[PDB]
Amino acid sequence: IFVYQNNITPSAMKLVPSIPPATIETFNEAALVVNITHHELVPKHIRLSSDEKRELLKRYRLKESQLPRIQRADPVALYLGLKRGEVVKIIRKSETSGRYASYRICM
Amino acid sequence: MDISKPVGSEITSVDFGILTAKEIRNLSAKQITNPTVLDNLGHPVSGGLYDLALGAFLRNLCSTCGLDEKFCPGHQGHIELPVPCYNPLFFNQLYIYLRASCLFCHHFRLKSVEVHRYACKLRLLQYGLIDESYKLDEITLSSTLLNELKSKRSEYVDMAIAKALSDGRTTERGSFTATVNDERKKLVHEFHKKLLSRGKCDNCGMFSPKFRKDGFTKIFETALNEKQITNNRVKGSTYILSTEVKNILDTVFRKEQCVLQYVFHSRPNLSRKLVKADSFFMDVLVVPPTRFRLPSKLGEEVHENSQNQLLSKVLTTSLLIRDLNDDLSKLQKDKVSLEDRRVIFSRLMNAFVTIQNDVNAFIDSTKAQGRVPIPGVKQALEKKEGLFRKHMMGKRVNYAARSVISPDPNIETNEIGVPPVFAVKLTYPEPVTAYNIAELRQAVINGPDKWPGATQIQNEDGSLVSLIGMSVEQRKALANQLLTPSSNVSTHTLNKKVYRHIKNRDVVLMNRQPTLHKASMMGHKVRVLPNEKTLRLHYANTGAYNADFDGDEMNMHFPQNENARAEALNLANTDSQYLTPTSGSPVRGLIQDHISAGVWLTSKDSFFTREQYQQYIYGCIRPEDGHTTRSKIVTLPPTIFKPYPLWTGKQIITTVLLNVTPPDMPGINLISKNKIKNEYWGKGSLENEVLFKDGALLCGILDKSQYGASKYGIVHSLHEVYGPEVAAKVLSVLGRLFTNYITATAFTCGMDDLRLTAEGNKWRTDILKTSVDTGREAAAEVTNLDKDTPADDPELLKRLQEILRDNNKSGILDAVTSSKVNAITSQVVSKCVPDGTMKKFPCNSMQAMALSGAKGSNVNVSQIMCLLGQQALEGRRVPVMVSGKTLPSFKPYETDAMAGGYVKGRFYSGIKPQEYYFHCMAGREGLIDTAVKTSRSGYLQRCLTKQLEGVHVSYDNSIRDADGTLVQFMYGGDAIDITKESHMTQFEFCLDNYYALLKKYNPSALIEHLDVESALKYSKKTLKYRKKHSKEPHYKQSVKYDPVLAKYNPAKYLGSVSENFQDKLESFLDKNSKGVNEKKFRALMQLKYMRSLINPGEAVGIIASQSVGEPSTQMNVTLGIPRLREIVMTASAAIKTPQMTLPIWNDVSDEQADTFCKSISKVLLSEVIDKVIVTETTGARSYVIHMRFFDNNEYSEEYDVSKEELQNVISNQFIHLLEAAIVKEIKKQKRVEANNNMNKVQRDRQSAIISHHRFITKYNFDDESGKWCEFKLELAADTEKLLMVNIVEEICRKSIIRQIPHIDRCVHPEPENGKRVLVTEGVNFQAMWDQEAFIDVDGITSNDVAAVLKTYGVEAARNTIVNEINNVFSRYAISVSFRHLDLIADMMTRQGTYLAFNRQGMETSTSSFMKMSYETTCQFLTKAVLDNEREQLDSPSARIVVGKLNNVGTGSFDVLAKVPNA
RNA sequence: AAUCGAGAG
DNA sequence: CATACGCCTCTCTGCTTATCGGTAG
DNA sequence: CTACCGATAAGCAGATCTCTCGATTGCGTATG
């Protein structure tokens, strides 16, 4: 993680993907002032592991991409460090059914 | 269709493609030679447009097929045009590919490394690999380096595809979804943009000339540059022929075949066919058969087909250019008349232009040039009256009738009155069998006139015989030989079909346009009546169809196959739709006169003797017609025994229930109320509540609330306890009961019901005559002048005139005066009705039907008998003429309620002409508003339903569109059916009826084929887990335990239920008040939940679209359909009215809250300037700009702005904006006292100002009072006159003093339902995130959706969407289910972005037919043919296009047949 | 067959 | 004077496109 | 220095239920 204020150097932004599988994330202070996951409007997002993700896929007889998608630029993916292909798990406080658990893949 | 000629084969998909130029030549049965369509003698001409080779034509045997006009299907031919013509469909793609191409090296003017990168990415996306296509960009790290990059990237992509195919993430055909389609289109779009941006070709270094276009069929290029030629020379508006562009494109496409195969194939190309660039050019046209180009005789006039016209025009130009080529060879040998040779060569060029434009006209009418224009092929299938919508989505149909509807309360509520004329015309082919010959022989004997009868008899060989012109003995022979063995071997499994008339056995489809929701098209068992020629309909269905009898008519479709009969009889029949899935509220029930008769028969004052009681019961029931259950009518004990046996009306209702309700089943122990307050019946009355018990009525009265458009009634509970069938029979039986009753004791209304008493009139008159002072005081208060001032006051008149001129002031005045006169009206109504009427309820029949809900309302009664009241034009009183008069009679600027549209009259004693005029204005406005609102919701509903029309619950309880993509895992999170959730939370009723509910929720009959342990065990486990974790913020709570339905099948595992349901069930089981025990009650509630689940394949998307569109017919933040379409139809980030809700800390004061609001709210420079004075002096052209400021003590404490801050603003923003404005205007033009020296520091500031700015010469801002600020200004002498007022004003308005960005005010609204809130006129979350001392930043919820999406996440965006969509429905209290709205939100956030419901929001869908039928059929057709998309035939629209059984509902499964023998 | 006009719910 | 053959101006969304400069080769 | 590009207000393409009646259909000029 590299927290950057004001503006980062545009010449310096072309090196983050080039790195080997070891990633390098940057986060601005602008969204760092308030933890958005504490805001009760935003549901609590949680990661998923390979085994349970494969279990979900076998339960629903689906493809990777047929699931709903969450975008790589989503502010909560910036919080949770989601890679491309990590099925986030969201908890839906649905008024109709109290606690409900849904998903959105990150691709 | 016929049911005895099945079709072995069936279409399974369809893939678009380009018709190759040589296959048509191989295909074509004849070329098209000469334009002349027909010669004389009425004969076709060989080589014309009506050749016999193109199909049969008017008893001319087809020279290709040899059949006649009834059997020749047509045969395509081709016209060979010499010069290849641009295909107008793909002109933009042709331009894109021709441009950004280097004819020098025959490659794209782009680096081969980047081109190969894009090609590899696309070949990866073809198999659905989305992450691989992004990690491909990790290899970047000169010929050797570039070739190494190519080799490694291609090896990596091949390995990635091999891994995907081995694992199973793809097949040989490829993995294509909505997300993959989005990624592929995004990548292709960026690739085209990157390609059409470069300068000189980067693969060789050579420049290439540019191209241009004047539209379509208009191609041109350009010349090089003076420096470019030098670059080219050291490296080493001309017209372009169509064949030249083709020759350019052929080479480059042969070179880039790899990238072009990965662009022009969204699926992996199995056929490995090439991508030939001649596809963009139509070398040869196709002529549709004479069958599709026939003419018609409109009497004696015969019209030549427009397709023939355009094709003959194209062929005329073809013959022109061909015969012009004959004489171009004449000058070939004589190469000395080259000038005239160049003349005819320009003629040949213009003929090329003409033929290309002729083909452009033949395809797209608008792509022609010249200013009745003939429709083209694109125009023939483009729009609403095109082909897809007018002939594939909806078609005229056979065996369907139509007539005016009329009422008939003597048919069962699941029936319809079929006139005899239809019953002898509509038919149904009944294949004769040994169980039908008794009635089918009779139908054949009776023939086509005597119902029941038959019209045709279809023979075993499929041949037809007509009974229309036969004799009785002939038809007798036919009927006696009807069923007989067939000696023909081929048709040894077929039998005769008799086209019998429609009996009462069958079922029919009824539909009253417009079909706002699905309930407006149900099924009715037919009953044939020998009355007039009109359809007769029961009264309960008027609510479902929204139908009246004022001249209404509705289509009556007759299903012609057992599949459709069983469909309409079980899924769509009118009884199976008691409630609507909009909100789960009832939609059926008796309407007006049955209700008003119920208020009388169930009145406590009504008794009926033995004879009258028994007559009523028998007439209502008629056991011979099946209304009973005990094979003999049963009775009741009379209420009274001495002197003589009397009964009661409530006993009549009780025995009616007892006779319809099935025996050995407890009666409905119901507790509810109705629309009639206790004080109406007198002191000590308890009639407000009804107390049903054991199938007996014991208190209160029946009403609209217990049958009709009201919930929790007796018929609703009969529904909830015995299904919808018994409720339907109760509706029918009460319809026949209150009808025969109302004949004996009729119901009427008259002038006596509309009167008052002397005291009532006195009260009315006095409280009305207060209105003079009422209106004057409203005006005086609004104008802020002193109260109790005479109306003729000049200041009052002036203020009223200013208010009239200003729209907002007029609105404020109207609102205040309207509130006052509404207060006066309410006082009058309360004091008079019901305490003043000379005739009182229940005698006062008008008031009775207003109270009872049969018709009208308390408002209607009040304005008939007491006061018509203030008239509302839009949200105002009445438009006022510019002279200030509201009418000719009323004096200008009159302070008077009667002038301001407040009518004091009543319809009983008439209205004065001025009030008549105002009331006419208001009524006309209402009519216009209704006329607009009828059509406003049509586009909204159609747009929603075109996209949601496929989504349907999978057999895994998850809802997912027909392409497979998943929108939600549970419907609303609970899988609870909207219709079936009627009484899930009505535990008191459930307990009261447990013993009756058991007979349907039989455990011993529904326990074995289920698991009853695991779900309940895990449920208790998770329940205890959640209880133990107690209360903690949702981001802290663990997720070790999930909802039970997520892991356990809600339909296979008992006890797997929602979480709200469990909490409320335990809370109401905490009563501990009574056989029935908690275990049996719990088990029965859980079986109820198990049977209350949406069945798989339910058309949930259609249902939600209807539930969100149909209520929209009855429609400061935007409200109504505008808000709804803004949320869903457009998804506009430029939302008209954005706001954010800011909770404030409980430990703050109100005054501090206002201080913080004014600290945040935006202030502009113009807010604090009384007047700015400009002194244009030319003797160089000086401009003293002296600005007057408001009182410092006032504006400092109104805006929280200080002298120092204003000084900074003027010194930095305002002067510079003004200077830029002055200099820009000149650039475009060519085409109080003071002291001479404030102090030395002031003079240094002045010098700094002069140095900093360009043509300023003075400056000084009062720092001790903040009352003025001047700055002298000059320009040169060449400039003209300048306004120096409008520019100053606009710059002043733009320039800001203290603004939080994206916020333009912060008001303090009065708290509602607690939870104090500060709401602004903008959205900027970053701004208040810094301020936590006041705002509870953790709970800011804003009006916008894009803002919250990009600053908080997709799920916060979906929350905001549901909240906003419910909010607009919540101003009118049209409560729609929280499941439809969430389904809409998650369908419009299914790609991680805020998507709308329009053509832009459906681009990334696999079904091209859906988009083409929706709109812009051409553009979606190009996007499907060019990528060679294989339409998979799974969206409902595609099925309708091709003719395949829809998969939603009864098409979500298949049907087998267990044979008995090997 | 289109265009224009009258209307129905 | 019949008969026959062609030339001609009072909405809103969402994607065509901006002029210019920031800034590393 | 300048090309690569990243972003700045304007031109155009395409949107905005079912039904039953009736009336009428652009002209100019050339040969016999």
Ligand SMILES: [Mg+2]
């Ligand atoms: Mg009607």
Ligand SMILES: [Zn+2]
């Ligand atoms: Zn033929």
Ligand SMILES: [Zn+2]
């Ligand atoms: Zn080149």
